[model samples]
Target chain A: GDDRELAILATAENLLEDRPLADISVDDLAKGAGISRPTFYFYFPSKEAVLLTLLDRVVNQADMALQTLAENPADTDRENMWRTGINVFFETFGSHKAVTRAGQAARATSVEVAELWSTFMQKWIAYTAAVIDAERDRGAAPRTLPAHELATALNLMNERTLFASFAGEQPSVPEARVLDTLVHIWVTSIYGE
Target chain B: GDDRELAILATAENLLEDRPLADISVDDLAKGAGISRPTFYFYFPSKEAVLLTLLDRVVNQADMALQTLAENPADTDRENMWRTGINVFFETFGSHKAVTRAGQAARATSVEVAELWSTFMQKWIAYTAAVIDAERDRGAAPRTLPAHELATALNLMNERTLFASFAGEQPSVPEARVLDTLVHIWVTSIYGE
Candidate 1:
């Protein structure tokens, strides 16, 4: 029953490790999952559907990391908290570059995935804005720019940098320097260091 | 001969006003240019080739703006210079939304466009890094992060935010607030106000 669906997902994931989603045909997916072509269709609509599912899992892990950091003790050091959160984001996305890159590519052609990504981005911006306001209320952060505006800019910076790096674009944040540089900008921009 | 090439470019620019590049076919470009499809191909290999050429022109305008700012007298006010430079960037890219969006969408699928975009990004990053170094040398900006790292992060922020706005993605920098917010972050982060 659902075992076949799980098998298809696993097969897609494994195949993606070796090649991009574009090169993986339905036949390859079906053969890798030990299912017939019709069976693969019965479980998933298309390859992109499987990719969306994988991206959902990756987004969940990143969200959990953020939520964990949000729930930490109020007295935790500010820079350290920011450092860990930024690191978790990079690590989570970096570890799943294939799925992430696929999802990014799909966003241009797939309305479903684009809406999903947009929703996640809005949620993130809201969470970040709330944190900025909270820090200001605690007298820890100064009100430099509007909270929403600041969060939107910083969050988008992270998204773009990570996508560029994953796509192997030139002049992206070097893998070695991404965390420190982002953390520094976040802290200094928010806390007025 | 070159007049026909310019006509094709103009027609594509006009057509993109109504639809995306994917929806615009070779026939449309040929018809809009009042030329046969063969002749259209004679001038440009494909619609993407035309878009790339258009993008090159847009980038040249942006580069000239930056170069003009760099050549300003050394004693010009730092904040004013940053504000003007940031504004020019937004204006240049924002005004050419159609071509810019098409190029971004094409980058994933077109190796030629991808390499062109990568080269442009590297050049912009290097220029920005040099500006940050000069500012620090004059004791106008603080040395918080490495100049290369800071410039890379900030420039990518501008690129991503503008692309998102063009794509109509949620949580993007608002049209009215983009310049002021970016200027604030750039000024504050580098100058450590």
Candidate 2:
């Protein structure tokens, strides 16, 4: 019975990969998990609950990548860390383009999804703000704007740019070009490097 | 009658000014315009058709604003011109937030909407690129990247940032900060000004 809940989440991700959230019905999700519609509700209240759970799982995985970036400094330069973090952010959604795309569309209409997106954005901004703060204190980063404000702006840029590049309908540009330009903006702003 | 078609477009805008596109239907449009549903279809096939027609109108108006920015040079330095153009762009969408919001949501699943958005974006990129090209030629702007590429990046930044601030479900930052930060990024990236 416990395992059925996990299967529902997994199946939701599989189904969501190629379909808009609006197009996916609860019955489809339950069938994919080999459970009846009633049983599906036993694990999650609704289809959106399934999506929120999937979103949390992906966010946690990306958070770990950010943590790794923060922890490893032995040979890590800011540019390297920035590249790794941005890549992880891109790929995190890029690989999960289906889910990301669905989330992007659903978020506009669903208050729950919108709130969840806002929470995740704040967590990311805080992490980035700390990095900006540390660099400014060490006299290695730009001091033109406050660390918190700069972090908020840059993170918003990343969220918007990455979502468009990774999840939008048009053909995404080459990953190298997208990632390079992203890193260039961050570095030049922070270190002028 | 031809006036009926224009009336449908007019009423759609009036209705959409306060609501999502999905919330406004053909029946509503017909009623709002004092026409029958069949008459509404005579002008445009569906609600989306009505939206697309309305989209073209607003876009045409915004394009005129950009044209004015391009043509005027009285006491308009680059930074001043940039500010004026950016403000016009913001107010253009700011006034049409209802339609813009609806358009952003519909774009994910609608091929017509997606293509329309791309067309608008390209028009914008070309206009911004010409500005960058002129500045770089006069040695007033940085040659850090090719004019078109830089234009694409800056325009994308503006597109992403503006949409988030203007169209999102939650309250974005204060207008002054959002607009100020955007202009700062553009000026520093282009002129280091």
The model with the greatest TM-score is: 1
lDDT of each: 0.85, 0.75
Q: What is the TM-score of chain B alone in each candidate?
A: 0.93, 0.90
Cα misplacement distance, residue B162 of candidate 1 (Å): 1.6
Residue A76, candidate 2: alpha-carbon lDDT: 72
Clashing pairs in 2: none
Positional deviation of A182 in candidate 2, in angstroms? Answer: 1.2
True contacts kept of 1: 0.85
TM-score of chain B of 1: 0.93
Writing each residue's lDDT as its tens digit, candidate 1 over B60-102 gives: 8998988887787446677777888888778998898888888
Residues B144-184 of candidate 2 have per-residue lDDT tens digits of 76566556666777666677777642324445566776666
Find the 10 residues in a row with the least total lDDT in model 1 chain B: B69-78
Give each prediction's DockQ, rounded to 2 decimals. Answer: 0.73, 0.32
Superposition error at A100 for model 1 (Å): 0.8
